[PDB]
């Protein structure tokens, strides 16, 4: 209902306020410059009204207590009536000093919001992952339970995977699905295969036979390259859009072997 | 995700595939557009063809018997590229003095000028309506693009001259520099038309207008132009022995600029002026029929 | 149970703050809304007077005017329109959601014609986003003057007439916030007014100090300014485009974009659909060096409403290729949301564009009968057509069309794609082309050698962008596209010379296999090919992957590093000129002496220069040319 | 008296028709609305439940529950809030611009951590976007149970319930027009949910008619929760890997995390991520900027990366989650954008900070910059500001250097002391710039060279104009300066006056060809090379400037540097050249050979060559020569 707080932002970068005749490369880091010498201008003038302040405040206050102390003397009423006088003089004075520091208070109220006035660092935290310990695990082992509870997990969408012909979509579907680039997805579907020979459905078994291959070959540069299946497998589908039929030919022939 | 089992004739749309609805099993025009998404503004919808195949997508709701469209709001393949888009942009090094220095002998074609002073002074324009201070402003710190575009760069000292620089950015011959520069006061409209009023009139020569030199003896050249009266005419804040400037009169500018129209010189003049208060403002000079 | 009945309620109190704090992010819509109603009220009139010219009797003149007062901090909006009654202020005025403009809706049945702008009932409060208070001083013709007042604090007021003479309309007060003194500058009205209410069927003027010299005349000048001039540009798509003329319409051209020079070529679009709307297409006759700098948002095509300015969407409403045109597109069936700042249910703009995109073909092939200007066209904005080409699919079947080269029989005469192919021979039954990077290279390449000696035409290619598109246009006017750069470049021939080649590769079988062997992971495959006629050899692109030029292109220009496609896409052969002196020595010196070294490596050296010839970077320069300073060396007896 | 005072009115029956057409543009948000507000009301019950635990006896669960009826066609949402009394009904619920999560909020005041929104009063009207009509079963803890029904025709009524109990909260019921059954698709409802309510504290379950067709509970939907929300030092590296391979859906984690926070006017939590390579598609245009989500108390506002955050940092992932911002009533914009834009200064100090950090982190950091070096050099050719910064990640491989790059701080503690000048060379490949004969004198020189090899380079370099005080200077263009001994330079003048009248000669025969002809030191095993003027474009920017699809030709006369032949007058061919201007400099041979050895210079010096066809056509007679062919 009211978001008048934020009607007053400064930001020094801001590229949606150009010219076609200036060099905004330049110019932003002037805006910072006037920013900044903005503030310091602001900062040294509340500085000394303060201290101006200060100053007839203790002024007074010492007149103050020597008017205490002429009224005592014996006499000195003569001298207090002048120095009250005085003393009025210094509080108006530093009255005046507060005036100004309320102008500067209303200055702080108009003061455009910025990196600086709207917010501090309320938190960082950094981290580098780096890691996880250099180690090993069994393939095998994992496999012992990844295989049997993995494959059916994600039985459909390897079978999915085994239903699909058009190369962006294999390429898209395992960019979705990347945790099913593996061995044990490539091992369902030759299964599926044989499955799906069992069951006289030849056209799908090949269909699935050739998608087999292509996870086949994910796999057969994965480990050629020394690296994990899931992060290059979109380079085995840029390979296959952009080789040369006879060098194409060539991989499926190296690749039905590595199946 | 739709699979094509057969094409359709090459027309309008191109390649139109006639492809399968795995689902249902029928068959849709499946067509498609390459698209971008942006823009420098930042990564952010073409609108136009992601929304096209949208539309498209959109008849298919009313199953309208007359509207073959394209197979999906998706924008995917298709087989067309990819070899992604991207591009990048060369920054324009073109500096004013270089455009000088390629520039022809005196009589640079005034109209030319014209559109460059133009172009300057609607940059000044927008400088002063952001108070952008740069009385430090010389012609080096001018672009002049390869479209004949004028650049502005390098709001003064305080922001310029990180690197390696001038040993005499000062005590150099200071003929762009107002006399209020020359006076040791400060920047205002009139100081920084002063010194690309003297630039205008170089380009004109391709030649420096003004040359003296010590603050002093560069006004002693600059009046040889605009003319010189005695301490009755000088601002308050001056530096140098006012009065101690033998008085001379000027030197019709549109006789001593090469090309220099009549109006320009009269601009000029202004722009020359000693009095700041007597001369011309950016959006005067700008608005003027001259230019 | 008992089913108890209740009207929906609504808080006013919070309902008000949201309006104005909640409704509207750009305050710009101030002046938009107020002159928006300004002009209602005036349409009001106009009806009213069509009807019975008495209704003119207190005042004929229909106009807005605008009226600064910085010694106030407040502006003043000079409503001559048909003004409101006590009752309109406290009904209309005074209710959220209330609008007499509906009432005009309902009763001009007669007054088709009359057309208001927005209906909402709300736009008003807007005022208050910039204005701490707005006074409503108004006498309708069917009541006296009266003055609505209010801070938008939950409630307002009306006052009795106060003798300020208003007898027709309106004086609306804008009484303005401290922090929005900038829109007492003359700059800052100008800047708003301008996206605005640029076609306002009424005049807008602005009461302005006015710059002067000092009144001490000795001199002087006028003390205020009437800023008419920001009706200056009136509607043109509104009439008729039969009565439309260039001596009007060049005038809007250069007033819709400042470009003191006529359009090129132009095209008025009149749609009676359900999404009636006119717009006028602009293309201008030089590029602006902005055309490919996609990092600026696009505004050459723009939407009004009702003749109102909403947006600007160019993204939405033209293809990134046609991002040259320039136009209005005025529609007054549009469905905005509350803050008429965005169109609601895009796939009207998706058929909007569509449609725009046929006028914009259509104008296209218009100019192509127009020659001499074409050329001018097409050489302004030809990549923006490849572009089309290319990514538009949409439209191919036009845009190819529109596609003008230069070939090696037309010359330096540029010609159609059509007039290629009504001109092929009837052997020719493929186009021949060949890409490159200038015209003289291809032109004198060994490429298009023989083919020449066929009788044969060569569009030449020279832009990466023809690079590009001959990637998409495969076939035109039914016969497709050959390139001679690449291998298995099948010229009609005479078979018996095909013989006389193939005898020539049983000649040269044996120097084919040294020189493969000599160039082994050089070349792909070393042949022979009758295409060359001047040269030994030639190296050529495969039937697939990046050509020389391709490769140079999207190696160069890419900024993606994909080695990946690189790799697959870098493939090459090497063919032989059997007929050549140098040609028939190495296979006298093969058959001489195969190991002889020294002809290797003439193998090796026409190779490289071979690869030369055909565009390919040589893996190592420098030591092609160490062979060449040692050869000099030789030749100096050094 | 002469004024009279009005309250300001409101006529409900259009001002509702206004909510329901003109105030939303899209209109599945209906489900966000309705979700917020079920939430809202599980944070009252908790808030009630922290000063009397038995409030929970009316259930003791927390949630959202979706049940999608197709069979009426229409949508139950089941909302286990506190409930609304029959005054709440007809006072909050059926009232515009009201709302009594602001009364509940006063009630926070005394102290809570509670966080709810809805300071409109207004969302519950989204529902009939969609929805032709709405029914609202209510039984609050402290009343009886009723039915509130209205399809916004300007009134609604109220009822007793009968049949079905509630505990407590609310059920809505959404009797969804019927052009809005494709609400009714699980992957249509899930779509909205994942669009902005990902990050909902309270479950959030679909119940979906499948095996046996019973409405399955799909407790999963909304099982994503905050992070950043949660103290970053009490968030192990595992949660940070989970929660980005769950932002992303990157089954590889991110190789860095970091947590950023403001606080005062502005004040948001935030999670930025550094993935551990590029995605295939880092320069694509076709690209959505929309790598780091911003949300208002969990809440998905939009995905504005395009302010939010640089270009050349348009790869790392997060979350922004602001505590306060000025939304529009359409809480899909915020308003002063000015607000992002300084969000996003906080952000890139931030990303600096990490950049330097992974910097100290060698090993991360060289895989880093291979996958991300580019973007780098981005920056340092937009950001004129930061550009600095950046420049301190930059590493390139240099002479002295094997294939491991270094920092241009580390090629400058490697700088001699009479070196002034960070020596370098572009080009196409590093190998291609190894054997420039610009480089040899260098070597020769003790001098190391920065190898510059990808086209960006161009326009990187052009901003690389000084590093920590030190200037830059290329090996291909004129103006080389290596240590030049007073011997030597007596011995270059003596040189110079020797094969001067052969530099002369040489440009008569190339006046077109070649700007300036002139020996020079900087060669080593040439007899000579082309150099590039220091004002235009090198021969490395030349050629991949020409390969640019929509680059300006014209603008080329600006930027046509020229060119100049040196020479090399050590070698046994320039001094035989002397030797043969002093025979006969009208020799035609000779002249043949000067434009052979240009042409070969120029071509081997990395310049665009004039006619391949006919320079190969040279050779071909040489060629025939040397075969005795003719
Ligand atoms: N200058 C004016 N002269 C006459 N009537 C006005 C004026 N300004 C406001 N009104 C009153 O306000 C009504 C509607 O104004 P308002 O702008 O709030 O709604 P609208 O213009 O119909 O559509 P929108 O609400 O989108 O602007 C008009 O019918 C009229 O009664
Ligand atoms: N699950 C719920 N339990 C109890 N009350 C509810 C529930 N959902 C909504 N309400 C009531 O609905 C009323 C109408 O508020 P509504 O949600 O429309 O405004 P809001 O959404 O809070 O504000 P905004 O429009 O900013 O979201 C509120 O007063 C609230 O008490
Ligand atoms: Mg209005
Ligand atoms: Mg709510």
Not at chain 3, 517 to 537: A, G, M, Y
């Amino acid at each position: 209902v009211d978001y008048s707080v934020w009607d007053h932002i400064e930001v020094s970068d801001d590229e949606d306020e150009t010219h076609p005749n200036i060099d905004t490369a330049s110019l932003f880091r002037w805006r910072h410059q006037a920013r900044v010498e903005r503030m310091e201008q602001f900062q040294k003038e509340k500085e000394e009204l303060d201290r101006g302040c200060r100053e007839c405040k203790r002024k007074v206050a010492e007149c103050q207590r020597k008017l205490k102390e002429l009224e005592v003397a014996e006499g000195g009423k003569a001298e207090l009536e002048r120095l009250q006088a005085e003393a009025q003089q210094l509080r108006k004075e530093e009255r005046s000093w507060e005036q100004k520091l309320e102008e500067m208070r209303k200055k702080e109220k108009s003061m455009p919001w910025n990196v600086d006035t709207l917010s501090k660092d309320g938190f960082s935290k950094s981290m580098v992952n780096t890691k996880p310990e250099k180690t090993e695990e069994d393939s095998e082992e994992v496999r012992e339970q990844k295989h049997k509870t993995f494959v059916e997990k994600y039985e459909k969408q390897i079978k999915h995977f085994g239903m699909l012909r058009r190369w962006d979509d294999s390429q898209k579907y395992l960019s979705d699905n990347v945790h099913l680039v593996c061995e044990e997805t490539a091992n369902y579907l030759v299964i599926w295969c044989i499955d799906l020979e069992v069951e006289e459905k030849c056209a799908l078994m090949e269909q699935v036979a050739h998608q087999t291959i292509v996870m086949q070959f994910i796999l057969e540069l994965a480990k050629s390259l020394k690296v994990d299946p899931r992060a290059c497998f979109r380079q085995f589908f840029t390979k296959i859009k952009t080789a040369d039929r006879q060098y194409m030919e060539g991989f499926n022939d190296e690749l039905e072997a590595f199946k | 995700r739709y699979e094509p089992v057969a094409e359709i004739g090459v027309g309008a749309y191109g390649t139109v595939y006639k492809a399968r609805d795995p689902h249902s099993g029928h068959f849709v025009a499946l067509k498609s557009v390459r698209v971008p998404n942006g823009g420098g503004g930042g990564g952010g919808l073409p609108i136009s063809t992601v929304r096209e195949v949208a539309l498209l997508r959109r008849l298919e709701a009313f199953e309208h018997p007359n509207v073959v469209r394209l197979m999906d709001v998706c924008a995917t393949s298709r087989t067309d590229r990819e070899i992604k888009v991207t591009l990048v942009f060369e920054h324009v090094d073109q500096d004013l003095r270089t455009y000088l220095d390629k520039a022809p002998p005196p009589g640079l074609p005034a109209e030319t000028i014209k559109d460059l002073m133009r172009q300057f002074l609607r940059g000044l324009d927008f400088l002063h309506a952001n108070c952008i201070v740069h009385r430090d402003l010389k012609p080096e710190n001018i672009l002049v693009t390869s479209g004949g575009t004028v650049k502005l760069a390098d709001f003064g000292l305080a922001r310029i001259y990180s690197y390696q620089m001038a040993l005499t950015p000062v005590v150099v011959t200071l003929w762009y520099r107002a006399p209020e520069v020359l006076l040791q006061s400060t920047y205002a409209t009139p100081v920084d038309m002063w010194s690309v009023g003297c630039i205008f009139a170089e380009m004109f020569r391709r030649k420096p207008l003004f040359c003296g030199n010590s603050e002093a003896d560069q006004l002693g050249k600059i009046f040889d132009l605009i003319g010189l009266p005695p301490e009755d005419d000088w601002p308050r804040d001056v530096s140098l022995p006012r009065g101690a400037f033998p008085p001379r009169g000027p030197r019709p500018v549109q006789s001593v600029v090469p090309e220099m129209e009549e109006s320009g010189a009269q601009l000029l003049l202004e722009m020359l002026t000693f009095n700041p208060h007597k001369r011309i403002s950016a959006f005067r000079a700008l608005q003027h029929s001259y230019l | 149970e008992e089913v108890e009945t209740f009207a929906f309620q609504a808080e006013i109190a919070q309902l008000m703050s949201l309006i104005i704090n909640t409704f509207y992010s750009n305050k710009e819509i101030f002046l938009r809304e107020l002159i928006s109603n300004a002009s209602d009220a005036l349409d009001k009139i106009r009806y009213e007077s069509l009807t019975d010219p008495s209704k003119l009797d207190s005042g004929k003149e229909l106009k807005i005017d605008i009226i600064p007062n910085p010694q106030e901090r407040t502006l003043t909006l000079v409503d001559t329109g048909i003004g409101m009654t006590k009752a309109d202020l406290i009904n209309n005025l005074g209710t959220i959601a209330k609008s007499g403009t509906k009432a005009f809706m309902e009763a001009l049945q007669a007054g088709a014609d009359i057309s208001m702008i927005g209906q909402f009932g709300v736009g008003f409060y807007s005022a208050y986003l910039v204005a701490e208070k707005v006074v409503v001083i108004t006498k309708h013709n069917d009541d006296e003057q009266y003055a609505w007042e209010s801070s938008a604090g939950g409630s307002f007021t009306v006052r009795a007439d106060h003798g300020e003479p208003i007898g027709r309309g309106t004086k609306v007060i804008l009484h303005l916030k401290e922090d929005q003194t900038e829109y007492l500058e003359e700059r800052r009205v100008k800047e708003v007014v301008k996206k605005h209410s640029q076609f306002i069927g009424y005049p807008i003027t602005l009461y302005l100090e006015k710059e002067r010299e000092k009144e001490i005349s000795k001199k002087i000048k006028e003390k205020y300014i009437d800023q008419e001039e920001l009706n200056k540009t009136k509607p043109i798509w509104t009439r008729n485009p039969d009565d439309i003329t260039q001596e009007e319409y060049g005038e809007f051209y250069k007033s819709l974009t400042n470009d003191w020079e006529d359009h090129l070529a132009v095209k008025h679009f009149s749609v009676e659909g359900q999404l009636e709307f006119r717009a006028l297409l602009f293309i201008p006759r030089r590029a602006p060096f902005d055309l490919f700098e996609n990092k600026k948002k696009k505004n050459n095509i723009k939407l009004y409403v009702r003749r109102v300015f909403i947006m600007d969407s160019c993204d939405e409403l033209i293809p990134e290729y046609l991002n040259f045109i320039r136009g209005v597109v005025d529609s007054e069936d549009l469905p905005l949301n509350i803050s008429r700042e965005m169109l609601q249910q895009s796939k009207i703009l998706k058929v909007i564009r569509k449609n725009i995109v046929k006028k914009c073909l259509e104008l296209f092939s218009e100019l192509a009968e127009d020659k001499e200007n074409y050329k001018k066209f097409y050489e302004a904005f030809s990549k923006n057509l490849k572009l089309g080409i290319h990514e538009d699919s949409t439209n191919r079947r036009r845009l190819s069309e529109l596609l003008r080269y230069h070939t090696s029989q037309s010359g330096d005469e540029m010609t159609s794609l059509s007039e290629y192919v009504s001109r092929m021979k009837e052997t020719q039954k493929s186009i021949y082309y060949i890409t490159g990077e200038s015209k003289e290279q291809v032109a004198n390449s060994a490429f298009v050698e023989r083919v020449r000696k066929r009788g044969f035409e060569v569009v030449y290619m020279t832009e990466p962008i023809d690079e590009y598109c001959v990637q998409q246009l495969k076939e035109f006017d039914g016969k497709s596209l050959v390139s001679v750069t690449k291998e298995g470049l099948e010229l009609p021939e005479d078979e018996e010379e095909k013989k006389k080649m193939e005898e020539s590769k049983a000649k040269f079988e044996n120097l084919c296999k040294l020189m493969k062997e000599i160039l082994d992971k050089k070349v792909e495959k070393v042949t022979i090919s009758n295409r060359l006629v001047s040269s030994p050899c030639c190296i050529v692109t495969s039937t697939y992957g990046w050509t020389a030029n391709m490769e140079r292109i999207m190696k160069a220009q890419a900024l993606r590093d994909n080695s990946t496609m690189g790799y697959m896409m870098a493939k090459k052969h090497l063919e032989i000129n059997p007929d050549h002196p140098i040609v028939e020595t190495l296979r006298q010196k093969a058959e001489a002496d195969k190991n002889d070294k020294a002809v290797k490596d003439l193998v090796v050296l026409l190779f490289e220069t071979a690869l030369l010839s055909s565009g390919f970077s040589l893996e190592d320069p420098q030591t092609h040319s160490n062979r060449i300073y040692r050869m000099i060396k030789l030749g100096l007896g050094i």
